[PDB]
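User: As part of a screening pipeline, I want to sanity-check one entry by hand. Below is the sequence and the SMILES for calcium ion. Please return the complex as C-alpha coordinates so I can compare it with the automated output.
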Amino acid sequence: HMLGVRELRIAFREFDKDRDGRITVAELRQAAPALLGEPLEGTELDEMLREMDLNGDGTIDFDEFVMMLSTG
Ligand SMILES: [Ca+2]
Ligand SMILES: [Ca+2]
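Assistant: Here is the complex for your manual check:
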Protein backbone atom coordinates (compact mmCIF):
# COMPACT_ATOMS: atom_id res chain seq x y z
CA HIS A 1 0.00 0.00 0.00
CA MET A 2 1.06 3.62 0.43
CA LEU A 3 4.10 3.93 2.66
CA GLY A 4 3.64 7.68 3.11
CA VAL A 5 4.26 9.34 -0.26
CA ARG A 6 0.53 9.97 -0.33
CA GLU A 7 0.79 13.32 1.41
CA LEU A 8 4.02 14.09 -0.41
CA ARG A 9 2.20 13.58 -3.65
CA ILE A 10 -0.93 15.52 -2.84
CA ALA A 11 1.24 18.51 -1.93
CA PHE A 12 3.63 18.49 -4.86
CA ARG A 13 0.96 17.59 -7.30
CA GLU A 14 -1.22 20.30 -5.73
CA PHE A 15 0.94 23.33 -6.44
CA ASP A 16 1.83 21.68 -9.77
CA LYS A 17 -0.52 22.65 -12.59
CA ASP A 18 1.04 20.36 -15.15
CA ARG A 19 1.94 17.23 -13.29
CA ASP A 20 5.22 17.67 -15.02
CA GLY A 21 7.00 17.25 -11.73
CA ARG A 22 8.25 20.81 -11.17
CA ILE A 23 6.91 23.57 -8.91
CA THR A 24 8.67 26.77 -9.86
CA VAL A 25 8.35 29.86 -7.75
CA ALA A 26 5.62 30.50 -10.22
CA GLU A 27 3.55 27.47 -9.30
CA LEU A 28 4.23 27.95 -5.63
CA ARG A 29 2.94 31.49 -5.92
CA GLN A 30 -0.11 30.25 -7.73
CA ALA A 31 -0.67 27.71 -5.00
CA ALA A 32 0.67 29.42 -1.94
CA PRO A 33 -1.98 32.17 -1.77
CA ALA A 34 -4.87 29.71 -1.55
CA LEU A 35 -3.22 28.54 1.65
CA LEU A 36 -4.10 31.92 3.14
CA GLY A 37 -6.42 33.48 0.61
CA GLU A 38 -3.55 35.95 0.19
CA PRO A 39 0.14 35.85 -0.95
CA LEU A 40 2.07 36.09 2.29
CA GLU A 41 5.02 38.00 0.81
CA GLY A 42 7.51 38.07 -2.09
CA THR A 43 10.89 37.72 -0.42
CA GLU A 44 9.15 35.35 1.90
CA LEU A 45 8.76 33.03 -1.02
CA ASP A 46 12.16 33.10 -2.66
CA GLU A 47 13.46 32.67 0.86
CA MET A 48 11.52 29.52 1.63
CA LEU A 49 12.28 28.40 -1.90
CA ARG A 50 16.01 28.71 -1.33
CA GLU A 51 15.42 26.52 1.72
CA MET A 52 13.29 23.96 -0.12
CA ASP A 53 16.02 23.40 -2.69
CA LEU A 54 18.91 20.97 -2.31
CA ASN A 55 20.79 22.24 -5.30
CA GLY A 56 19.83 25.90 -5.36
CA ASP A 57 18.28 25.76 -8.82
CA GLY A 58 15.09 27.57 -8.03
CA THR A 59 12.63 24.72 -8.57
CA ILE A 60 11.04 21.90 -6.63
CA ASP A 61 11.39 18.31 -7.71
CA PHE A 62 9.76 15.35 -5.97
CA ASP A 63 13.29 14.29 -5.14
CA GLU A 64 13.83 17.71 -3.63
CA PHE A 65 10.39 18.14 -2.22
CA VAL A 66 10.45 14.67 -0.73
CA MET A 67 13.96 14.73 0.73
CA MET A 68 12.82 17.81 2.61
CA LEU A 69 9.37 16.73 3.82
CA SER A 70 10.35 13.10 4.16
CA THR A 71 12.08 14.32 7.34
CA GLY A 72 11.49 18.05 7.69
CA1 LIG B 1 4.96 22.58 -13.30
CA1 LIG C 1 15.91 22.62 -7.04
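Points to compare against the pipeline: The chain has one domain: 1-72. The CA atoms of residues 2 and 55 lie 28 Å apart.
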